[PDB]
Curated annotation (Swiss-Prot), chain A:
Interacts with host entry receptor ANTRX1. Residues 85-96 are annotated as: Interaction with host receptor ANTXR1. Forms an icosahedral capsid of pseudo T=3 symmetry with capsid proteins VP2 and VP3. Together they form an icosahedral capsid composed of 60 copies of each VP1, VP2, and VP3, with a diameter of approximately 325 Angstroms. VP4 lies on the inner surface of the protein shell formed by VP1, VP2 and VP3. All the three latter proteins contain a beta-sheet structure called beta-barrel jelly roll. VP1 is situated at the 12 fivefold axes, whereas VP2 and VP3 are located at the quasi-sixfold axes. Binds the host receptor ANTXR1 for attachment and uncoating (entry). This is Capsid protein VP1. The lineage of its organism: Viruses, Riboviria, Orthornavirae, Pisuviricota, Pisoniviricetes. Changing residue 85 to A: 90% loss of viral replication. The chain holds residues 674 to 931 of 2181 of the full protein. It comes from the Viruses.
Amino acid sequence: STDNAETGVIEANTDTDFGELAAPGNHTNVKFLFDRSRLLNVIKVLEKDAVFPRPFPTQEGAQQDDGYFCLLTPRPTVASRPATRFGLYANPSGSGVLANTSLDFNFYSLACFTYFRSDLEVTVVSLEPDLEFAVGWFPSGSEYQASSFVYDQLHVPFHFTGRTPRAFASKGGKVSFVLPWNSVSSVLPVRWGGASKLSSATRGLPAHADWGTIYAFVPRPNEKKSTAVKHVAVYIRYKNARAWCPSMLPFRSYK
Amino acid sequence: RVTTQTAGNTAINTQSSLGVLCAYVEDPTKSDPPSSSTDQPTTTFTAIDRWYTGRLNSWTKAVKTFSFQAVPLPGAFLSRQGGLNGGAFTATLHRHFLMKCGWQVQVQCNLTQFHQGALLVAMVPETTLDVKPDGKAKSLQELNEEQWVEMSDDYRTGKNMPFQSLGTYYRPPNWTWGPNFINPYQVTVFPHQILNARTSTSVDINVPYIGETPTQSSETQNSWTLLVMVLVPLDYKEGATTDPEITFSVRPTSPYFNGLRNRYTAG
Amino acid sequence: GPIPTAPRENSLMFLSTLPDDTVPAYGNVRTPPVNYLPGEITDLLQLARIPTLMAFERVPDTYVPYVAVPTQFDDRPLISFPITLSDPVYQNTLVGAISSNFANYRGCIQITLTFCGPMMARGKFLLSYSPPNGTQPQTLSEAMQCTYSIWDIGLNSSWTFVVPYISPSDYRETRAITNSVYSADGWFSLHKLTKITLPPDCPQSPCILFFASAGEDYTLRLPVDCNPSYVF
Amino acid sequence: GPIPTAPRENSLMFLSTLPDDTVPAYGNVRTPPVNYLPGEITDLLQLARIPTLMAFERVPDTYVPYVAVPTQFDDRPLISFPITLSDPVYQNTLVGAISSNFANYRGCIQITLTFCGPMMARGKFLLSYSPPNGTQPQTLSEAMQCTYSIWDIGLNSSWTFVVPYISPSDYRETRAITNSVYSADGWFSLHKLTKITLPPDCPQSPCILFFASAGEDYTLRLPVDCNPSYVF
Amino acid sequence: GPIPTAPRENSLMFLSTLPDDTVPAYGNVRTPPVNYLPGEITDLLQLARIPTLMAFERVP
Amino acid sequence: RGNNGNMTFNYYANTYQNSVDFSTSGILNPLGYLK
Amino acid sequence: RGNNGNMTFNYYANTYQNSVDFSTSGILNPLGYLK
Amino acid sequence: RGNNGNMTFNYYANTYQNSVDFSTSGILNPLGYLK
């Protein structure tokens, strides 16, 4: 029919040309679609007080504990820090240390807007049989407390106690709870183009776009360290999500 | 199809026009002062309530499909790109810390009926194309040699945006993706108009203010970016006409300013 | 006193899509208002209703989104493609991208065209839509009998062709594997009825742009998992 | 009969901040009344609103809480400090100590001064507040353009300077690590506009005392863990 | 506060004919109507009331 | 109706418990009529 | 609203269940208006 | 009042839940008055 699509705003079934007005029969709603769990990352389990990674760039011969901790955000991250370029180690054995990375494939498969906001609901699942553990979390912009104290000649890491929530699960159990949107920024920028500092900043790297941080540890004294490593899984959900402006979608190769 | 819009002491004429695209909401002009500060703000006045004009590179047959050029806002004012000179607006910008404003632009071309081709212009929000992959803004001298940006798999995948080097402690990963890819086939989602060679000459858009905070820093914000891309390569009979030119006009709307101080300096 | 109870067979189970809440841990937190942000989204159909561009293989990357009219033809449509949403031509369109993440769809697809060439040219085109058959129709004589329409170059260079929805079932699958009647729904083709008259001094070979989107009665039902292939 | 039930996935869990009570073990106990004790506290902001003293490095412990005016000057403020609550100067003030245990703050800081010297002296001072910039302003000419005020020695020897709250976000972080725009908020400085006239027989070199506190619209949001460093 | 309770002797049991429902996992799904199909059955006695044939050994 | 005993309380909503068809807007009948 | 089935009883208070913004005191609109 | 979420039902009696003193029969006041 007559129209002018160069103007952009085109008009708007078969009743117009030849109709059929098939009756309705809301599964695409933003609030409904995003309410379901999905894996985020897999992390080790602590057995003593750890040293948080230093900010980049990290020089050779720097002592720290890497592989633990994990942010709560869909945007790409590296070494438990915000990042922009997603990457992976597809190459064979090399040298140095390998940096853990994460990303929300399912979220970005339909991330067709710019700004987002919702509540987060976290849960944790163990992997090794009959494993006992616990979880700890702190808000954005805070810091992880190091060092340990002595009780009856046993070194208890400080992270056993704090004003932030703690969770103890029975042998072979699971954890779950819901946290509030606590970042300073009003909404989460899916893609950004600003700078966080007046000088020496990196374009397009947001500062406090997340929900917090999480870690896992065993309720034992530091005098009972073991050798075999342990692992833990993490899942997240979104509650009352909202979107605020259109955007693009990931490109699909034509190979 | 003949209308003129008057603002301040300057006016613009349109021999052909379809209308004005109002973007997300009706009446983008309406706005309110921010809420993340207390000091009284500075508002609009006649000195800044007017248009501004600039120039772009020429269009040549050698250009292929999907090539593009970008003009960040308001960073164009600060960089003096394309000869644009904000004057009073730039002077006021350099003497403040917080800003909030809309935008309203129009682009014109001099295509004649004896030419075939198409152009697409849109206001892509929250993008970074000006910066080189190294992590430094493209200089005015560098922007001249290359008149149009060549589309490539790297840009399509967003694999070459600025990043932070890890350091000798780690091993270099293989970068393969980033959240600022460019998808040419879907650029029409943002407000746009098709500048065909046989239907019209001038296009225009009206956009409101957006951002993840009620106000953004006035020295680094890059909310809106003006993008022009070529769909159908230019072609014409030899000897008729050569390489038309391009121009554009800008005008802020209902701005606010906060945080007075001396002139900005770096180091 | 204690209330008698009997735990069921599915206690201590974890469901990834259970419609229920969880206990709060750090409640009683306020947040800044967001009434200043315009353009809130409510349903992805709003984005699905926006036109976008298609792709084509081009002669022997080469995936230009337009088709160029040749000079001499041979009893064959200029371009034709199936109506299966898993087809390559629908890959990057918003409708195809969104639908690929759902199982069932329902409604009328919408196709829009636009001409790009010299003003003083003329011509006439024919658009066709053939439901499923044993063999894809080729000749103009065959095409004419099925549903069709005639497009005439004039002041307005754009035209919209609405594909009717006919199928033996209320819903239809979104991706085709066996090409059963439940997924495939025929073909679409473009035929040059006349010969395009290029005015003097206008060089040659105009081009046509394809615009596709969803109709006003589109719908999707069942969510599914995604393909992370785009990360590699 | 028994009521069917289904325990959830998070049974037998212990939360250190769960908002719920526990079963009593030794209830039904009375206690003596406490209506005789005056001065009950309800909110720590009441204590946060009380002025206190600051610290300064002094010339080469040496952390006297006052600043002494020199005789000859050189185009530079007598004392300046950032507006980051993690700065050393804010360590022992009540506002700094309390805020260090919370994540986000909001409101206007308050600064108060007082003069200590001979009665029959005279002078004039200038106070400045510079939002974030590429370089900290130094000269009086620069300082004058920004927000400022002039203090005159007279019958009243005390003055209060209110630091306005301007930021791109509703809330701000309490401790700075990267010095991002979300934590740092500029600098404060003191400049001697004139030369202080010491009356005869009054020896020299008066002193100034710094008083800091919280404004009337201060606020803190998120509790956090503490630092036990004070025990060592 | 917590409500006291006492699980019975037959907890965590599975019955193949227990008259009770189960928690939904993928609810909120609509289906096409079936008002166009005639001849709905309600009780198998309707089919039981229909004559049929018998069998007999016949001579060897 | 059906092998369902509970007759006091349904926790989850009907739409989330059972499917519903979308609108398009003793005594036993015999399966054979002989005019 | 949302993928929530329970419609009979909410135990914890709304303020402790969901965040709330502090006061400062079918039919689908199109995202583009063309005057 | 306090970090308590439940607002529907208290099982045990108040006397057995919290201590009680036996009878002997926004707006914030300032802790200092200057006559």
